[PDB]
């Protein structure tokens, strides 16, 4: 029941807390073609891209030293763009996925936690 959702909330919370560059954004849906293309850019990088439950992402960003109570719990397909291994490679993957779509709405998370910018985030990323 809701207990299951509770430990898996905790699991995604740890997953978001351990990572430094975790920049998740809803962009009017993420396509399986888009997932394919972005993961090919991430070839070998064992990180994943997905859209997942809103509560778990909510408390993951909340417990990931950020705030996500309603920032990443609404607006349909909430894309989870996290990164692994090199912070450089994480930033490059984030910039590439931002450039994948036409004009992507920066939703939640940040690189190194606690976002201060939304346009410089795309400049730091590249």
């Amino acid at each position: 029941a809701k207990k299951d959702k509770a430990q898996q909330v905790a699991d995604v919370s740890h997953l978001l807390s351990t990572s430094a560059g975790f920049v998740i954004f809803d962009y009017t849906s993420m396509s399986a073609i888009e997932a394919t293309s972005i993961r090919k850019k991430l070839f070998k990088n064992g990180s994943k891209i997905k859209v997942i439950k809103n509560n778990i992402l909510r408390r993951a960003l909340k417990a990931g030293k950020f705030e996500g109570i309603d920032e990443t719990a609404i607006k349909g397909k909430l894309a989870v763009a996290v990164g692994v291994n090199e912070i450089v490679e994480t930033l490059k993957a984030v910039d590439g996925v931002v450039k994948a779509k036409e004009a992507m709405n920066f939703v939640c998370g940040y690189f190194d936690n606690r976002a201060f910018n939304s346009a410089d985030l795309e400049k730091i990323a590249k």
Binding site: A35, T36, R39, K40, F43
Partner: peptide
């Protein structure tokens, strides 16, 4: 490798 959705 490039046609597929794969990485490896």
């Amino acid at each position: 490798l490039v046609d597929l959705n794969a990485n490896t």
